[PDB]
mmCIF file of C-alpha atoms and ligand atoms in Angstrom:
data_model
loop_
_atom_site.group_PDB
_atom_site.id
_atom_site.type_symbol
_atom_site.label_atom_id
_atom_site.label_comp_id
_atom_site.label_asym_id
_atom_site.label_seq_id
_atom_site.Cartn_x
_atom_site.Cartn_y
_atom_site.Cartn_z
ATOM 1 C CA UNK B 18 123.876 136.878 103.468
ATOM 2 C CA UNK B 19 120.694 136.262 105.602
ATOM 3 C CA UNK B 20 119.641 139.839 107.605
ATOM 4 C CA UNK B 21 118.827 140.359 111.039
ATOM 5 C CA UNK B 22 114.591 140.026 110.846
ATOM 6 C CA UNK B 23 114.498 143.503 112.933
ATOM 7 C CA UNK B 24 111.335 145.366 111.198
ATOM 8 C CA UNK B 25 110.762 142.283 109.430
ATOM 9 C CA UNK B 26 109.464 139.953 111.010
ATOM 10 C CA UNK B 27 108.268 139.596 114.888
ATOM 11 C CA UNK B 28 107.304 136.391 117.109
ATOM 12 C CA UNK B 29 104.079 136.848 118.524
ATOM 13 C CA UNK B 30 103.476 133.406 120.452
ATOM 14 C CA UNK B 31 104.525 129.623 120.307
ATOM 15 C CA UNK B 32 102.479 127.146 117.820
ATOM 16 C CA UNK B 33 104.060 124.168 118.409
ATOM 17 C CA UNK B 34 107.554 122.121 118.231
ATOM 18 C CA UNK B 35 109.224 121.123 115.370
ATOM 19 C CA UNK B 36 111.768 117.769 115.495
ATOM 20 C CA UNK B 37 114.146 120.572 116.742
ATOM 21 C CA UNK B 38 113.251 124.328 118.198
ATOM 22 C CA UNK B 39 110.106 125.781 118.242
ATOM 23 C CA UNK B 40 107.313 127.344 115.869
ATOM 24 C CA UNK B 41 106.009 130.670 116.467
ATOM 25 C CA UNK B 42 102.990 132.623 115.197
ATOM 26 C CA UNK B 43 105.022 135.648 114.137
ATOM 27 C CA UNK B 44 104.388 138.622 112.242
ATOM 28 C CA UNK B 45 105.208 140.807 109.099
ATOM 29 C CA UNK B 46 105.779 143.837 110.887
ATOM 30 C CA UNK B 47 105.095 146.138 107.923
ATOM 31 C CA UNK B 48 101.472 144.567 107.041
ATOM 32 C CA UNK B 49 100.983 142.898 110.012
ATOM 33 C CA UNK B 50 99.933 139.530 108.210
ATOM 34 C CA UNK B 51 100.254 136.428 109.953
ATOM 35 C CA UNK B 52 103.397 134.289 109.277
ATOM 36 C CA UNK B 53 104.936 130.839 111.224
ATOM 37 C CA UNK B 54 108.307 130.986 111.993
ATOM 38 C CA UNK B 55 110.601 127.916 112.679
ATOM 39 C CA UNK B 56 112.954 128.966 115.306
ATOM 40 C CA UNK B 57 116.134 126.829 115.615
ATOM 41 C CA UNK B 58 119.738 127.600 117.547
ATOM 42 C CA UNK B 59 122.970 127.546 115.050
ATOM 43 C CA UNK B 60 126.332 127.541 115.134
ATOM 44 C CA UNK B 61 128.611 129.925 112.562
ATOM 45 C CA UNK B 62 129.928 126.744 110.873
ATOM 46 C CA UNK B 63 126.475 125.650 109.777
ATOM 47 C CA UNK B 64 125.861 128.683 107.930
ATOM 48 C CA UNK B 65 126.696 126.551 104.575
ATOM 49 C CA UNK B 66 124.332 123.750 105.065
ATOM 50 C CA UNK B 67 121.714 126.176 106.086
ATOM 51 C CA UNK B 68 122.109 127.661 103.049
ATOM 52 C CA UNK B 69 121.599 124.621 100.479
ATOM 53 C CA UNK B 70 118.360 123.593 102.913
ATOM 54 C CA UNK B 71 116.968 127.319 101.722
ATOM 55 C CA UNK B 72 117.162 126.290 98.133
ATOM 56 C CA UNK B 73 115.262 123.298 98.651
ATOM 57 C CA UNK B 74 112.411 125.268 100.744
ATOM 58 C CA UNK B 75 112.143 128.005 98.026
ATOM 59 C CA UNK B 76 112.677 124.978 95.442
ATOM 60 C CA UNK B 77 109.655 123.011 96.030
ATOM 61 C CA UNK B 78 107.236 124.950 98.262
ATOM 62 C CA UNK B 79 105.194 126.462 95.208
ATOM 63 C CA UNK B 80 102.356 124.074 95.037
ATOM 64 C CA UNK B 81 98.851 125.294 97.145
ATOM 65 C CA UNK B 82 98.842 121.242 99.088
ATOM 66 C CA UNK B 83 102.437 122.767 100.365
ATOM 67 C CA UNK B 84 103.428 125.717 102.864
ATOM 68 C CA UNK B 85 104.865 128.926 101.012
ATOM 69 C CA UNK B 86 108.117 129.319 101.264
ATOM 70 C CA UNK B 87 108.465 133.260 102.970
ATOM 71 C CA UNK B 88 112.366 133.945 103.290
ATOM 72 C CA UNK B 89 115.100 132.869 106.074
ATOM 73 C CA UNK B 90 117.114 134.889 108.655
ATOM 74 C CA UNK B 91 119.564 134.969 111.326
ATOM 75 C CA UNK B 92 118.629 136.782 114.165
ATOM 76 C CA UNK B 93 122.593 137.314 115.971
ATOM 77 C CA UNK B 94 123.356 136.645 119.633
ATOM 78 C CA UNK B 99 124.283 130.496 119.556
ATOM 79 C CA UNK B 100 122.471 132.711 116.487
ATOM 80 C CA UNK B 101 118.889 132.157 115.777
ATOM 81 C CA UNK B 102 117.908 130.587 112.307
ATOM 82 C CA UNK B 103 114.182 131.945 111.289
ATOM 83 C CA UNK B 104 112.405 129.891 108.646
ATOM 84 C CA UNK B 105 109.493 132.170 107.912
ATOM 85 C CA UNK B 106 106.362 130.131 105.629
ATOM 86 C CA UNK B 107 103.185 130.549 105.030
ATOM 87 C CA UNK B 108 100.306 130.585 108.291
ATOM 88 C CA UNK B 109 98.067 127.969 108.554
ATOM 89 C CA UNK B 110 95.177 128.956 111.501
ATOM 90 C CA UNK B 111 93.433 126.195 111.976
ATOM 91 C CA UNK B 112 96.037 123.651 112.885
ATOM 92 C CA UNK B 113 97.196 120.009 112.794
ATOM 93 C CA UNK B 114 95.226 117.243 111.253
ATOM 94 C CA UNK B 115 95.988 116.090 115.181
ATOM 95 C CA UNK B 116 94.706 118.951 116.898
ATOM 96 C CA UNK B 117 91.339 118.340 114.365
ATOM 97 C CA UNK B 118 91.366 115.105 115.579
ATOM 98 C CA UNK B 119 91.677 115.528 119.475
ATOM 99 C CA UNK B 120 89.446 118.625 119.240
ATOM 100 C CA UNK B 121 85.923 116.215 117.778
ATOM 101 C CA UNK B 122 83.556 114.724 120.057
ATOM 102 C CA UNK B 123 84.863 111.099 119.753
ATOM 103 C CA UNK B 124 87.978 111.649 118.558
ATOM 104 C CA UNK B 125 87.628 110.607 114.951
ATOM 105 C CA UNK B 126 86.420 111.923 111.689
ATOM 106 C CA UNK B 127 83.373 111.383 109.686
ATOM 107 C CA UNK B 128 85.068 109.070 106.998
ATOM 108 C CA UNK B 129 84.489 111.846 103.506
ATOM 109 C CA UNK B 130 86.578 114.308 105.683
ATOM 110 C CA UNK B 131 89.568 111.464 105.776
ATOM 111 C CA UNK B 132 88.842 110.568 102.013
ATOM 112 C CA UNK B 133 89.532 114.406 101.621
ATOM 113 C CA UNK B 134 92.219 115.410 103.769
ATOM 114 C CA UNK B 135 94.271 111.914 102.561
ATOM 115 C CA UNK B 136 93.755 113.183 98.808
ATOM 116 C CA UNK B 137 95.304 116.821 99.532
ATOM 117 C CA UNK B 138 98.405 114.999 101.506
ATOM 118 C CA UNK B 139 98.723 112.793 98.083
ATOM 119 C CA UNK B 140 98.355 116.023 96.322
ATOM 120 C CA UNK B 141 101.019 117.667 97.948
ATOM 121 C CA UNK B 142 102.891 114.527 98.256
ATOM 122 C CA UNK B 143 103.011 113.863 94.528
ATOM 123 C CA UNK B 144 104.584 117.378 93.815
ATOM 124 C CA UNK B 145 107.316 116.475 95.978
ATOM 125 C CA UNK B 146 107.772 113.060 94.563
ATOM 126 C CA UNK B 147 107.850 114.443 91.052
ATOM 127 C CA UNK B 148 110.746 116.493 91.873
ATOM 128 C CA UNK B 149 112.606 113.865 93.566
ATOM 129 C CA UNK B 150 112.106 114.896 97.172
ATOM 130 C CA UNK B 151 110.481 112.603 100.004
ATOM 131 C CA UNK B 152 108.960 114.359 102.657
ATOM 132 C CA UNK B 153 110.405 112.102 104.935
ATOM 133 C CA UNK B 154 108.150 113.238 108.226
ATOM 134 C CA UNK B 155 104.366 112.992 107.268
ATOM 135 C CA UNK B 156 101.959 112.787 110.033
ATOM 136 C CA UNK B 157 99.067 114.581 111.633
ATOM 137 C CA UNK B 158 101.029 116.999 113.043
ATOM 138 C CA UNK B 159 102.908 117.904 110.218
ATOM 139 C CA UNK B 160 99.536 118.113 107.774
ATOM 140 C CA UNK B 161 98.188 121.742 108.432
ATOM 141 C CA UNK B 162 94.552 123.427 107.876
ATOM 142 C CA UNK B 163 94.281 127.115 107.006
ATOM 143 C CA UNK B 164 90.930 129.191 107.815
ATOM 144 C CA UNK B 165 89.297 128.086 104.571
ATOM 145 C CA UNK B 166 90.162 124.768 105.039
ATOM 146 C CA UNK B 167 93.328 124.162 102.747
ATOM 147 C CA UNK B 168 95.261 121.498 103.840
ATOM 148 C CA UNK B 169 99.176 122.228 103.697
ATOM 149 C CA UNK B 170 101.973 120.269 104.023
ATOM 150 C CA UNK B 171 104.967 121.313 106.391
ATOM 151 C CA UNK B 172 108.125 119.858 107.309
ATOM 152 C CA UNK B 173 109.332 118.191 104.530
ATOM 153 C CA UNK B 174 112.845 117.153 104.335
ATOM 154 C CA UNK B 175 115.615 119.369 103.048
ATOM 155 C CA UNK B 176 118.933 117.932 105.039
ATOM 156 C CA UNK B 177 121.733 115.550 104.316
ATOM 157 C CA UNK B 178 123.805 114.366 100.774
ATOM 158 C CA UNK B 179 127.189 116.846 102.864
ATOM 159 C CA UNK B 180 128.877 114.382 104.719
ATOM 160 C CA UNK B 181 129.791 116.162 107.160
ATOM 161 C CA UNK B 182 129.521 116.102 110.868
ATOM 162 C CA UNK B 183 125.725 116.728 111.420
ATOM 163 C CA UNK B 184 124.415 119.948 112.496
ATOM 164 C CA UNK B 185 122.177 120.389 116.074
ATOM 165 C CA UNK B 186 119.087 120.951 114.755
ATOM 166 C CA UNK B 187 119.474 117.705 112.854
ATOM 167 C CA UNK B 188 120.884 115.261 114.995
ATOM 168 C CA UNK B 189 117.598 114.580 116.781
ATOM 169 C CA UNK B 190 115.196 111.783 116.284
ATOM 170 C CA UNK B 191 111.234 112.762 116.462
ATOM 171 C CA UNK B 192 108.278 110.216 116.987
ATOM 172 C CA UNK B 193 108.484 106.699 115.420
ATOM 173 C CA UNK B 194 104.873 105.562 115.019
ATOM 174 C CA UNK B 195 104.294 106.856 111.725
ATOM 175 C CA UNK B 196 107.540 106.008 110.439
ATOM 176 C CA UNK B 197 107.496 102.767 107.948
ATOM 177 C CA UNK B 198 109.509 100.073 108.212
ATOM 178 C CA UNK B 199 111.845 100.346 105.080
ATOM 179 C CA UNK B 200 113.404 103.633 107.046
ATOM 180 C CA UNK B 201 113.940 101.442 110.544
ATOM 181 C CA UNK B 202 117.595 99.420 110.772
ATOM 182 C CA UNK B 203 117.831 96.026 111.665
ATOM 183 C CA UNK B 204 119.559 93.027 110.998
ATOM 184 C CA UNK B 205 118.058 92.118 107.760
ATOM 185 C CA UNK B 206 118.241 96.178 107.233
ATOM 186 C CA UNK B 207 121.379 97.297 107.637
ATOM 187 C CA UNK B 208 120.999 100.534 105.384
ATOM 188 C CA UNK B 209 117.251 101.796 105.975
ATOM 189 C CA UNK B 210 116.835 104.607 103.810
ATOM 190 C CA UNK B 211 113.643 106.462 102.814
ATOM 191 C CA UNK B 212 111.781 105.665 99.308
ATOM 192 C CA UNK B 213 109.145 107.993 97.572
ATOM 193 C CA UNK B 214 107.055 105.413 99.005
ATOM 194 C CA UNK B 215 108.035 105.833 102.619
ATOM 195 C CA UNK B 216 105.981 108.496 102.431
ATOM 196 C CA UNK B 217 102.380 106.407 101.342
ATOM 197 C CA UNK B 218 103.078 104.632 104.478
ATOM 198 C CA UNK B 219 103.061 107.429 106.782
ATOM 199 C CA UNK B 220 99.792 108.778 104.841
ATOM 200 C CA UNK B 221 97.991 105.530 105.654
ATOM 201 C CA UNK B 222 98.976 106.163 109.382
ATOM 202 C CA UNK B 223 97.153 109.437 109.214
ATOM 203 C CA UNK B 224 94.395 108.283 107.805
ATOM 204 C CA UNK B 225 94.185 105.672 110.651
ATOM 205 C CA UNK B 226 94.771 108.788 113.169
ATOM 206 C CA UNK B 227 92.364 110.247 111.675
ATOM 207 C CA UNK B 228 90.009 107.776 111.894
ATOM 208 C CA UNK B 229 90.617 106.473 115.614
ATOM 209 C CA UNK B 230 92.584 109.654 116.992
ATOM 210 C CA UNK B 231 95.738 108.062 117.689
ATOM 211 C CA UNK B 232 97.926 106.262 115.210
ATOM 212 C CA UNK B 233 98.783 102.228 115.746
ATOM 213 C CA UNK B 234 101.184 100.852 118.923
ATOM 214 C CA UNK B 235 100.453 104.843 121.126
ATOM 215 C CA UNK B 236 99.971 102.919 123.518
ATOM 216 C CA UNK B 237 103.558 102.142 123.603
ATOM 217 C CA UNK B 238 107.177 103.214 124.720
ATOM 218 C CA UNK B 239 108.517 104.894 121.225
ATOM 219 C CA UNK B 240 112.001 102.923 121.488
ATOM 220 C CA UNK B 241 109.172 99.600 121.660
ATOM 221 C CA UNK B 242 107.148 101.152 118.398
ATOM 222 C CA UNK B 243 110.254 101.291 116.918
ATOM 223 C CA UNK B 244 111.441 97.695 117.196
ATOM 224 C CA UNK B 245 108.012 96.606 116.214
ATOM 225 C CA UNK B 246 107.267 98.176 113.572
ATOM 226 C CA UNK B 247 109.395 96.081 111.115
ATOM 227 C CA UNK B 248 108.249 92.954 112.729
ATOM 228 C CA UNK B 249 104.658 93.280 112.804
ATOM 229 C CA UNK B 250 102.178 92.838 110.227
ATOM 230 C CA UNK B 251 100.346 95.891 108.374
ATOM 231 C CA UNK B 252 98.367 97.657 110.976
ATOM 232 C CA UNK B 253 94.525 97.659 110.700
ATOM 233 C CA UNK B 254 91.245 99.615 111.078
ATOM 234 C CA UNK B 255 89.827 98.806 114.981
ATOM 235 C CA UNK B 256 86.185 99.114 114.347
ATOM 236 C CA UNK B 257 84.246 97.203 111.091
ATOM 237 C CA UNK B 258 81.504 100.610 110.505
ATOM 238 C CA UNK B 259 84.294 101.658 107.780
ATOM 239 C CA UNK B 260 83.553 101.460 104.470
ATOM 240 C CA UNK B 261 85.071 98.213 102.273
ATOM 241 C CA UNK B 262 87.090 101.806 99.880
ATOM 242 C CA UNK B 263 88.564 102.752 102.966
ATOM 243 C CA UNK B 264 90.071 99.503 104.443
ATOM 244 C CA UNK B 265 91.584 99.143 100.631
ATOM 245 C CA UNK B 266 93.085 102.351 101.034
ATOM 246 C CA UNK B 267 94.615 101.783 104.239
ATOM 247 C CA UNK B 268 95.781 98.274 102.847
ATOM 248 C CA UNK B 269 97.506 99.966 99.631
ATOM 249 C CA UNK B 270 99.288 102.794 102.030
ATOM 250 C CA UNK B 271 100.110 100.118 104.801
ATOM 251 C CA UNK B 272 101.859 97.438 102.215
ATOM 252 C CA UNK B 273 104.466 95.766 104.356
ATOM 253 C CA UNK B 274 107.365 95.098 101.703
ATOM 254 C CA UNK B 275 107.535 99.037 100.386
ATOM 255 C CA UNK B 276 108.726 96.813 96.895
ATOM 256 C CA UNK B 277 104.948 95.977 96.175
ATOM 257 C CA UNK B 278 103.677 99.757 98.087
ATOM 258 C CA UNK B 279 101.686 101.396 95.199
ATOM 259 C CA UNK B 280 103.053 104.735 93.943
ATOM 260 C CA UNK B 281 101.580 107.741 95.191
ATOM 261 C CA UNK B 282 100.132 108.569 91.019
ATOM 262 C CA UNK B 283 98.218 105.057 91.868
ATOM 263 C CA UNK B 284 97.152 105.804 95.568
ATOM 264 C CA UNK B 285 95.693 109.000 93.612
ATOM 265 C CA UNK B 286 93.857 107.050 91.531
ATOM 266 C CA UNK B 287 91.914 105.075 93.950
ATOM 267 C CA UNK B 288 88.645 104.761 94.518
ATOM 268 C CA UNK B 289 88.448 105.796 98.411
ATOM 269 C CA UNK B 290 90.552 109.343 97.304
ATOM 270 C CA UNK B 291 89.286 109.381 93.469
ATOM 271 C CA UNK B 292 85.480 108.946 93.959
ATOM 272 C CA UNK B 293 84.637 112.292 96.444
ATOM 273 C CA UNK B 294 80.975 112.933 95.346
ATOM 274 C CA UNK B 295 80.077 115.258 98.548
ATOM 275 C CA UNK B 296 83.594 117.018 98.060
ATOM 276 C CA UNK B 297 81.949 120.440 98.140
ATOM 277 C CA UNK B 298 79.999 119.521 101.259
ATOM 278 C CA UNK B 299 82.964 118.661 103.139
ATOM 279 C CA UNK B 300 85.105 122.189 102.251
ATOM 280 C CA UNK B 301 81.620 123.666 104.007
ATOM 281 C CA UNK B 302 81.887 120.850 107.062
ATOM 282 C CA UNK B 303 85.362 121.867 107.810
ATOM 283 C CA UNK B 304 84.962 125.536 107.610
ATOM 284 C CA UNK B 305 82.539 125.465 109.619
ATOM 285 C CA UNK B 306 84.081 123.230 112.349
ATOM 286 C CA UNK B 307 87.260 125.421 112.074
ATOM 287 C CA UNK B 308 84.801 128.764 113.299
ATOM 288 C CA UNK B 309 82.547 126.445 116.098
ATOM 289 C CA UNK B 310 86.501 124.646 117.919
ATOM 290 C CA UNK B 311 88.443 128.957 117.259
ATOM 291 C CA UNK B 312 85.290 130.041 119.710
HETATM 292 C C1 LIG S 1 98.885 127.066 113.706
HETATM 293 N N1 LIG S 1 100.027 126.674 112.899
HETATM 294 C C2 LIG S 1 100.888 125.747 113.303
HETATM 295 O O1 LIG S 1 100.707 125.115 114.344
HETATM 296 C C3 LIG S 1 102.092 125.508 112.451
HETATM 297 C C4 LIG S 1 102.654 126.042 111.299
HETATM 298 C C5 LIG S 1 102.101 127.020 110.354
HETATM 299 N N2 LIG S 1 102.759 127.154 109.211
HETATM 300 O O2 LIG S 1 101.095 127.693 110.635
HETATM 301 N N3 LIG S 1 103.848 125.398 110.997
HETATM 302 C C6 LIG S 1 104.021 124.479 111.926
HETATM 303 N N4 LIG S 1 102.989 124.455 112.847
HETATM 304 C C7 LIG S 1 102.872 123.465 113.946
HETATM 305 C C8 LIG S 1 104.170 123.345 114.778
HETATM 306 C C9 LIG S 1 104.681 122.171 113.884
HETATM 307 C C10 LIG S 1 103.182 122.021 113.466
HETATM 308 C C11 LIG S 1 105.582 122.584 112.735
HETATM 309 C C12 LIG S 1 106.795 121.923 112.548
HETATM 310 C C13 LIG S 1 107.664 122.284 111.533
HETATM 311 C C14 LIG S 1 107.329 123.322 110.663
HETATM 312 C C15 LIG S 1 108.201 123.670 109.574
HETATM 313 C C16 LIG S 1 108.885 124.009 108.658
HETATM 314 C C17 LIG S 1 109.681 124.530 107.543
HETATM 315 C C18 LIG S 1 110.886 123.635 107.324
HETATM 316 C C19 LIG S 1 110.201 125.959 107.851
HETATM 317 C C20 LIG S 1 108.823 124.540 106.303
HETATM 318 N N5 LIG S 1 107.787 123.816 106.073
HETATM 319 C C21 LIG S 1 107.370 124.208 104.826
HETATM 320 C C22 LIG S 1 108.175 125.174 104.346
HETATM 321 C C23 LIG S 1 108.232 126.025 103.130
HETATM 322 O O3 LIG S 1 109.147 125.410 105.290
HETATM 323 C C24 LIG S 1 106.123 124.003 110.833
HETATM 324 C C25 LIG S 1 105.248 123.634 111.865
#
């Protein structure tokens, strides 16, 4: 049922890389508005799963901390799967980061950007979805700063033998330890608060422009994770709000993790007096890194 995206839609250049394929600034041929387009080789036979992962985008992409939801299609050849969602300009949360003299954030910007991520986080959570993949690269700023959500996990529950595009493994270090196997672990699976985790390791990447253990092999972050204790803040300058909200995100045993309604509620993402200030300090850093 999904059309060709001839007339429709058009790939203008790559963005980026998703855990599989590629993202693409592409275009609505007709208007000639901006859209980014998730470009993934399938197979015939996972035409079905494809189809229930649509639902889910459509589903739960209506909220303004999440990507919009466009429409899907199969551009035929392996065929081409096109996820087409909502632009966001200004990049990654990591690109933000990489791109500021220093590499880290003035700490109101973090106490921001964290509070949108719980925002969009908290939609999902309400309708029983975990994102399953949050980290700077997946948090997204549009030209007025908006920060939007992308990425978030739509596979699985089929039993079936696992389709290409899913049978890959992306970068550990923001992944929390709950969701990494081991002998005490034998069935890691992902909890709502999974999620809190990984938005503590942002905040961190925002904060020092690299998240904990980057300086090592992934295969060695991923054998550490579990085994090491709660990752911390390098420098002391920090304010005491912000090393409590890294400790309540970073809780080892995901069993005493607060929820993200709590992490809402406290006073690092809660209290935001120079909010307005901050919309203005990003937009403005957006126009000054574009030229
Ligand atoms: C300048 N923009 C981007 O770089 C940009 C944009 C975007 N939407 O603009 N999207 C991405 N990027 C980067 C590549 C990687 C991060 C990346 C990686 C993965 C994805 C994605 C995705 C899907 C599943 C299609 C989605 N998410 C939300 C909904 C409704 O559907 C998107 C992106």
């Amino acid at each position: 049922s999904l059309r060709d995206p001839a007339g429709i839609f058009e790939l203008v250049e790559v963005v980026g890389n998703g855990t599989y394929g590629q993202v693409y600034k592409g275009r609505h041929v007709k208007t000639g508005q901006l859209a980014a387009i998730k470009v993934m080789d399938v197979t015939e036979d996972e035409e079905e799963e494809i189809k229930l992962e649509i639902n889910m985008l459509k589903k739960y992409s209506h909220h303004r901390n999440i990507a919009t939801y466009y429409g899907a299609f199969i551009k035929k050849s392996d065929d081409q799967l096109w996820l087409v969602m909502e632009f966001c300009g200004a990049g990654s949360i990591t690109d933000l980061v990489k791109n500021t003299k220093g590499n880290t954030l003035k700490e109101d910007w973090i106490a921001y950007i964290s509070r949108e991520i719980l925002r969009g986080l908290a939609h999902l959570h309400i309708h029983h979805v975990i994102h399953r993949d949050i980290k700077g690269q997946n948090v997204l700023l549009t030209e007025n700063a908006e920060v939007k959500l992308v990425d978030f996990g739509v596979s699985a529950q089929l039993d079936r033998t696992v389709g290409r595009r899913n049978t890959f493994i992306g970068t550990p270090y923001w992944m929390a330890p709950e969701v990494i196997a081991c002998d005490e672990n034998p069935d890691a699976t992902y909890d709502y608060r999974s999620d809190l985790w990984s938005c503590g390791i942002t905040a961190i990447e925002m904060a020092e422009g690299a998240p904990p253990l980057c300086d090592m092999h992934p295969m060695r972050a991923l054998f550490l994770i579990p085994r090491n204790p709660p990752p911390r803040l390098k420098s002391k300058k920090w304010s005491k709000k912000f090393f409590s909200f890294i400790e309540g995100c970073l809780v080892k045993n995901y069993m005493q993790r607060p929820s993200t309604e709590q992490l809402l509620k406290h006073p690092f993402i809660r209290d935001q007096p120079n909010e307005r200030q901050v919309r203005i300090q990003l937009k403005d850093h957006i126009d000054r890194t574009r030229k």
